[PDB]
Amino acid sequence: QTSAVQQKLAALEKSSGGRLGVALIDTADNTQVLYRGDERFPMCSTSKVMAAAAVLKQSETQKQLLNQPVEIKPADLVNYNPIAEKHVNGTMTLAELSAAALQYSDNTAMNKLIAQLGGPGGVTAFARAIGDETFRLDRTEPTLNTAIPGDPRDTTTPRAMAQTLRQLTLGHALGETQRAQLVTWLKGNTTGAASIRAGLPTSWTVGDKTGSGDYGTTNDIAVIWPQGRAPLVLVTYFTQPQQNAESRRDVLASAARIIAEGL
């Protein structure tokens, strides 16, 4: 079947010229709303959630792991380093690196998380351990954002990412204090006001992680606490045919508004 919500998301997509993927989980009832829910999309920096969560899982058996210093050398800086560049020739703790990756989208910080996990495959291994058979991380920053159409590297599906985000933030994939820490980090994101949250009523609380890449790829994944409702999890992924395409956070906002209006 095709629902009224799906039909509106298709109209949005058609007007945008790109390819839109949406997955909602309403924890009011566990119901799901999907649009291209089983198609693959480049995750870009939305993958930083899985990396940070994998480090939080490691921390469950090492009380001091999040306090552990990691050297930042000049050669570690990549293409977007707002926090890490201030610590070159110094150190950042794994907590600081997690916060920087999630809340500022720092790519050097993400690479330190990936390295703590033994490389991209360590992030994938964590995904598998928490029941996500779809996610794959294949490369480090910045090349994981090439977002080439048809390339399976560094992709997931909306369905899989929504399920995983639910399990991490609302379920029991992490221990209690780790789940709370992940939620605190997502709620304190600096980069999200133009994306999913811009499509939702202002009284709703959002924690999210954005991403973007080549092919005008523009993404957001969010855990949402609506006014008067149980929490929602919402993934919005968007990618375009042209390598040089402009980002389109407004399309993500529009998708979120359709979803909200359909509840």
Ligand SMILES: O=C(Nc1cccc(-c2nn[nH]n2)c1)c1cc(C(F)(F)F)cc2[nH]cnc12
């Ligand atoms: O920093 C960003 N993009 C970036 C960084 C490094 C390099 C390149 C790049 N490399 N080749 N072309 N562009 C692009 C960024 C972009 C976006 C947007 F609008 F969605 F596109 C939102 C953001 N919020 C926080 N940071 C961002």
Ligand SMILES: O=C(Nc1cccc(-c2nn[nH]n2)c1)c1cc(C(F)(F)F)cc2[nH]cnc12
């Ligand atoms: O790294 C990149 N973008 C970036 C960096 C940091 C943060 C964010 C971001 N966070 N939340 N939204 N966007 C995005 C990027 C990289 C590359 C490449 F070639 F693969 F290396 C091409 C790009 N075209 C547009 N952006 C990129």
